[PDB]
Design an enzyme around this catalytic site. Structure first.
Site, PDB file in Angstrom:
ATOM      1  N   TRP C  39       0.844  -1.173   0.000  1.00 35.38           N
ATOM      2  CA  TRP C  39       0.000   0.000   0.000  1.00 35.38           C
ATOM      3  C   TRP C  39       0.893   1.241   0.000  1.00 35.38           C
ATOM      4  O   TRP C  39       2.059   1.184   0.358  1.00 35.38           O
ATOM      5  CB  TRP C  39      -1.001   0.004   1.147  1.00 35.38           C
ATOM      6  CG  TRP C  39      -0.448   0.003   2.552  1.00 35.38           C
ATOM      7  CD1 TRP C  39      -0.114   1.102   3.260  1.00 35.38           C
ATOM      8  CD2 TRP C  39      -0.166  -1.139   3.425  1.00 35.38           C
ATOM      9  NE1 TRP C  39       0.352   0.759   4.496  1.00 35.38           N
ATOM     10  CE2 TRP C  39       0.334  -0.608   4.628  1.00 35.38           C
ATOM     11  CE3 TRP C  39      -0.287  -2.540   3.299  1.00 35.38           C
ATOM     12  CZ2 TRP C  39       0.719  -1.398   5.717  1.00 35.38           C
ATOM     13  CZ3 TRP C  39       0.103  -3.344   4.403  1.00 35.38           C
ATOM     14  CH2 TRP C  39       0.602  -2.753   5.598  1.00 35.38           C
ATOM     15  N   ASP C  58       6.053  -4.744   2.858  1.00 36.25           N
ATOM     16  CA  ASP C  58       6.294  -5.542   4.027  1.00 36.25           C
ATOM     17  C   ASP C  58       7.533  -6.415   3.864  1.00 36.25           C
ATOM     18  O   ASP C  58       8.036  -6.624   2.769  1.00 36.25           O
ATOM     19  CB  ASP C  58       5.104  -6.461   4.263  1.00 36.25           C
ATOM     20  CG  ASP C  58       3.879  -5.748   4.786  1.00 36.25           C
ATOM     21  OD1 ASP C  58       4.001  -4.630   5.320  1.00 36.25           O
ATOM     22  OD2 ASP C  58       2.777  -6.331   4.663  1.00 36.25           O
TER      23      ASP C  58
END
EC number: 1.4.9.2
Lengths: 359, 120, 110, 360
Positions: C39, C58
């Protein structure tokens, strides 16, 4: 900027410690937390599934874990394994299959050890019948099941022999196993009774010297096993306690509760007052520093509620651990000096270990 | 004193309840079970460690068998770590730092029960 | 700081700051794998007063870091604006989707 | 004495609630905690591995979970599954294999739902390409992806139709999907734009009525979707806010942040003052109770820092949840009445649900 992986741990090996977090509240996500003891920095971690155990290879290059998986965690086929991880990249390399009986239990050092020469991993089994399992690191194989150790518990390597270790048995003596270069039992021997199992049970955690080991008892006595020769010679008790100490019912308590500084012979022991039946795992009120040659205490310091410890010989350090926090002590002199506390190193750890530097 | 199901729940759910004298685990009675029944969907262990506990109400000493309930993840409630008469692993069936679910079809540890065997 | 949830680049982090986990804002901790996807946040730089695009890749394939948990939501939107959304695991497409920690990678001016 | 297993849950189904504990700090050991809401008693639990999601079958007999396994947790082959568990025994019965793209994310109701007739489980996929997944409960099978839902998110069942649901799309409208008896798409339709995605984004949590749904926006507006006919008719905004409310910048915040009491038309919404960009997931300073017919607030009460709620139409209750503690409210009157708080029901939960009673 671009995110990259593939990186090595950012601090040198000599700065690293390994806090085995059982995460008992969520025991299927136990893990090893890697810290820099010099500044408290978190360096990385290794996941160890259900009730992992950990050790670092003697040569410092690899981390060994022992764990249990099931196909669907709480159902499906069980796989007990040893895993080999790279120490610097903190990456998985190899899975070694074990029979489905590796010890599931709290992280006493003696449940997952290795031979002095580093060629064999030596681990405790319970099915619940007890035996000791041998893993050949080079071959990546389980090679021996020492059923001779039935009714015994835990592994105390002999630092003066390449592939020898001892275990504590129900007769109150020690069984010594000498492995051949193939990892199979080459010979064995049994000591005379060292301690009375019923009247003066010892804690399993050794205060381990190069050629001997000391054990403390539930009532504050000390037993010793000398393995300078092929047959182990046992003696004791001598008491940790003077008359004043007895008056206040001081006794040992903890898990990995003792340590030995080999250069000086000083033995470190977690102690608490008001001892009675059921207090053998109580947090330390004090750490006592015992001269093992004179058989007398030389110092005592606050225990900081610690339960487990470990010693680094070459940097003259002792770490203590209260379940969540790691205390770093300088033990270069008889009175330990507190250097720092690493807060929140684990949620539920009873075992901290230094990265080996001795090779 | 001998029938926890007739006793005050707050009493039996306490680590200081007399029969919990060598529990290292979560009391099953706080986990949807009772002192002698596993929470739904957890499986009793066929093996256990054994404690000897003193009953202050009747003054007698009793053998207590600490069977676990297994095959569900940690209950997390009423954690106890009491150690009366507990011994290390070289007296294996007196020892409570091992998972007594170790021989179950699924060894995941859920909670610990305190089953009265009889007089010591 | 970079280890504080208030650091300007972390304005849409829902996760553990990788810089507290043995990595940095732009490098995964050892043995954790970057996510190819992420994101995006638009975060205000309090120094030069400009807004920057931050990509929250991540690090994946290890269990939860557990340190420096943040839940900041500047310019964050629900899953119908999927790449602005932070209540999903951006490790979801990795070879192993276990979520370890979140990085805050500077892309450039918004 | 003899230790026995095989026992059922001690309290009857009508007393039960399900607290989905993500256990985010140890997300591989997520689980469902089963509680008795009448007395706060812990009744049992269902393990759900990595980021579990949970629902109860409409018929109240089974618990459905959705989770991800890997052969070695952090490595090895991925298995995304739905599991069927017996509700009374809390035992595992069946695994249904999914494609390895089930949504991994926080526990919004709309990521794991079922059709009104209970014959299909309907779940969000993200690979990250989005689609809706359909599981045939009778067959214990995955049917196929609803690819028409690409670029949309979450599942709002239509309680007035047996196997229809809607989803919210990036165009600010709703896509409606009508399944055939085999779980495949039989027909579909797309609404006009309901909300400006850029200027007034909505929270995905529906305040769901039998033939309509309401949604609140980041700025405290309400949008409505009426699906009483085959085509969905959309409207809004109306504001939740009066001038005083606006002067203090009150806006909604939370996760599963709204609820509808269907018989009265009262909508429940977590609200907080001093709203601005970035406050949309703030804990509730208050719970507002809105009459959706009159479009006015009828009550406001302390929020107890709640983040998620659920409503029981059959007992006229609202549960709220602050991440760890569950508050039980009587909502049989406009002003809710706090009955009790269950402390420590979870470590990190954003979703609580009642065991269904009735509902036909």
């Amino acid at each position: 900027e671009v995110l990259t992986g593939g990186h090595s741990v950012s601090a040198p090996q000599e700065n690293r410690i390994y806090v085995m977090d059982s995460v008992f509240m969520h025991l299927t996500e136990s893990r090893v937390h890697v810290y820099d003891y010099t500044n408290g920095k978190f360096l990385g971690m290794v996941p160890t599934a259900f009730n992992g155990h950990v050790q670092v290879s003697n040569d410092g290059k690899k981390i060994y874990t022992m764990t249990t998986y099931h196909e669907r965690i709480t159902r499906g086929k069980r796989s007990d394994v040893v895993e080999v991880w790279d120490a610097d990249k903190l990456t998985f390399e190899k899975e070694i299959s074990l029979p489905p009986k590796r010890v599931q239990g709290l992280n006493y050092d003696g449940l997952f050890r290795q031979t002095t020469d580093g060629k064999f991993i030596v681990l405790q089994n319970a099915s619940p019948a007890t035996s000791i399992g041998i893993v050949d690191v080079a071959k990546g194989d389980y090679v021996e099941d020492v059923t001779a150790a039935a009714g015994c518990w835990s592994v105390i390597p002999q630092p003066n022999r390449p592939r020898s270790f001892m275990t504590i048995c129900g007769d109150g003596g020690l069984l010594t196993i000498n492995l051949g270069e193939d990892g199979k039992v080459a010979s064995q021997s049994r000591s005379k009774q060292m301690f009375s199992v019923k009247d003066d049970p010892i804690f399993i955690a050794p205060a381990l010297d190069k050629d001997k080991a000391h054990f403390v008892s539930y009532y504050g006595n000390v037993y010793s096993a000398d393995f300078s020769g092929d047959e182990v010679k046992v003696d004791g008790p001598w008491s940790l306690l003077n008359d004043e100490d007895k008056a206040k019912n001081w006794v040992p308590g903890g898990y990995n509760l003792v340590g030995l500084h080999r250069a000086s012979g000083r033995m470190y022991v977690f102690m608490h007052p008001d001892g009675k039946e059921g207090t053998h795992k109580f947090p330390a009120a004090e750490i006592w520093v015992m001269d093992t040659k004179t058989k007398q205490r030389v110092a005592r310091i606050p225990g900081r509620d610690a339960l487990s410890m470990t010693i680094d010989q070459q940097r003259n350090l002792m770490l203590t651990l209260d379940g969540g926090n790691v205390n770093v002590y300088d033990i270069s002199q008889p009175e330990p000096k507190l250097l720092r506390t690493i807060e929140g190193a684990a949620e539920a750890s009873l075992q901290v270990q230094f990265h080996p530097v001795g090779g | 004193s001998l029938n926890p199901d007739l006793a005050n729940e707050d009493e039996v759910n306490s680590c200081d309840y007399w029969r919990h004298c060598a529990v290292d685990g979560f009391l099953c009675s706080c986990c949807g079970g009772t002192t002698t029944t596993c929470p739904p969907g957890s499986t009793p262990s066929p093996i256990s460690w054994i404690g000897t506990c003193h009953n202050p109400h009747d003054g007698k000493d009793y053998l207590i068998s600490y069977h676990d309930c297994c095959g569900k993840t940690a209950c997390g409630r009423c954690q106890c770590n009491t150690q009366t008469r507990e011994r290390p692993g070289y007296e294996f069936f007196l020892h409570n730092d091992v998972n007594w679910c170790m021989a179950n079809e699924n060894s995941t540890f859920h909670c610990t029960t305190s089953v009265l065997v009889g007089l010591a």
